[PDB]
């Protein structure tokens, strides 16, 4: 099936640049038109603009002509997004989408598959991996037939980590909370598990954590 | 730039409850029109084009009608996996334009949390530092105090607290409280404690453990 992954995200400095990419699979990449969307954090959906199968027409939003170059290499079935000078306005989660559904001799399309984004900062701080630490199942997280297990990854920047359990194969009552920013400017944050209480001792359970602005990649096993 | 306009905002409604928003276009858009669900943490997702057209694998529960500049999606029945926001984006033309969505939201009935407390990890204690972390796990509503105590006194000091969005399951939030000490000044106490207060609860509920034990 479609499937569209961004990468390229992290930290920028106000007037820097970065080229962001979206590898693809599923489907001919040559014969659709490739588009990109922005969210800024807790705001809407913002067009950016769309690439053609032989970038012969490629359109922006007026407003961004200046800080995006869109791209494409059919060859290796990937969409590209140059970032040009960007100012702290333009701090967004980038997805790249798949028109489709397109008009008879009419410039129509519905956005039919979206990558999962990638969140570009825009700052002038450094970059800082996380600390992983276990939240051990006890009888003092315990609540009958249900125990509760985590993890802690703790002091990053910028955000965003994910948070995956036992490699994807565990998503029932998974909680991963909203980062939090301590006192020392770095990021915090907790991924829990209510799993069964018998399972404690005979079941394996791993968090698998990364923060792809610094390429940290941790797995760590929970253990009660 | 056509501009859309989406009313309501956001909304609240029960499961089992019709659904109704509406979409304005600043002008007429024909039936170029589309609709997007946006789960809490999630990419957007298509789920109707050309006005009224299903996207594959999109529930029959979802509708959309309308022609020019007023369009209505609709929910028949709504579903605790419904939780999201929905966009509106017209297709008619360049620049192509969302409009500013519409957050939906899920009243349930008064769910108390269960409580589960945890110690700092030996691992973490190694590093010169003790995060304690007590979890308030699926509660409703989203209202809740949780006081920090420890040997029996209460803790005004480093905690931090962090809410989930509702679940697309049962429409609940968790919350979890983190207590940051130096491993000097979490050795000088031997009960931590945090004490929960929900409407779901007919007293307030105290979650402790012995350091060390």
């Known amino acids: 099936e479609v499937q569209l992954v961004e990468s390229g995200g992290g930290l920028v400095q106000p007037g820097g640049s970065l080229r962001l990419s979206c590898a693809t699979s599923?489907?001919?990449?040559?014969?659709?038109?490739m588009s990109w969307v922005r969210q800024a954090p807790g705001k809407g959906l913002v067009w950016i603009g769309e690439?053609?199968?032989?970038?012969?027409?490629?359109n922006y939003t007026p407003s961004l002509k200046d800080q995006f170059t869109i791209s494409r290499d059919n060859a290796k079935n990937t969409l590209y997004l140059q970032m040009n000078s960007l100012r702290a306005e333009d701090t967004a989660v980038y997805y790249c989408?798949?028109?489709?559904?397109?008009?008879?001799?009419?410039?129509?399309?519905?956005?039919?598959?979206w990558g999962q984004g990638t969140l570009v900062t825009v700052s002038s701080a450094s970059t800082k991996g996380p600390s992983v630490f276990p939240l051990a199942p006890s009888s003092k997280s315990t609540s009958g037939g249900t125990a509760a297990l985590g993890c802690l990854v703790k002091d990053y920047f910028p955000e965003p980590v994910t948070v995956s359990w036992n490699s994807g194969a565990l998503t029932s009552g998974v909680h991963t909370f909203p980062a939090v920013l301590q006192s020392s400017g770095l990021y915090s944050l907790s991924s829990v598990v209510t799993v069964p209480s018998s399972s404690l001792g005979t079941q394996t359970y791993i968090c698998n954590v990364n923060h792809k602005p610094s390429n940290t990649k941790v797995d760590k096993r929970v253990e009660p | 730039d056509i501009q859309m306009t989406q009313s309501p905002s956001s909304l609240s409604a029960s499961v089992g409850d019709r659904v109704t928003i509406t979409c304005r276009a600043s002008?007429?858009?024909?039936?170029?029109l589309n609709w997007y669900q946006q789960k809490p943490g999630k990419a957007p997702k298509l789920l109707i084009y050309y006005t009224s057209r299903l996207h594959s694998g999109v529930p029959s529960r979802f509708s959309g009608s309308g022609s020019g500049t007023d369009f209505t999606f609709t929910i028949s029945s709504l579903q605790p996996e419904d939780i999201a926001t929905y966009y509106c984006?017209?297709?008619?033309?360049?620049?192509?334009?969302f409009g500013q969505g519409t957050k939906l939201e899920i009243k349930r009935t008064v769910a108390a949390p269960s409580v589960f407390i945890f110690p700092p990890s030996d691992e973490q204690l190694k590093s010169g530092t003790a995060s304690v972390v007590c979890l308030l796990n699926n509660f409703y509503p989203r209202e809740a105090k949780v006081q920090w105590k420890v040997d029996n006194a209460l803790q005004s000091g480093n905690s931090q607290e962090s809410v989930t969005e509702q679940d697309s399951k049962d429409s609940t939030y968790s919350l979890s409280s983190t207590l940051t000490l130096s491993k000097a000044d979490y050795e000088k106490h031997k009960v931590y404690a945090c004490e929960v207060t929900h409407q779901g609860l007919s007293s307030p509920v105290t979650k402790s453990f012995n350091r060390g034990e």
């Open positions: 690439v053609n199968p032989d970038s012969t027409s490629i």
């Open positions: 984006q017209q297709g008619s033309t360049l620049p192509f334009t």
């Open positions: 599923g489907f001919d990449f040559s014969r659709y038109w």
């Open positions: 002008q007429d858009i024909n039936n170029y």
């Open positions: 989408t798949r028109p489709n559904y397109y008009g008879s001799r009419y410039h129509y399309y519905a956005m039919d598959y």
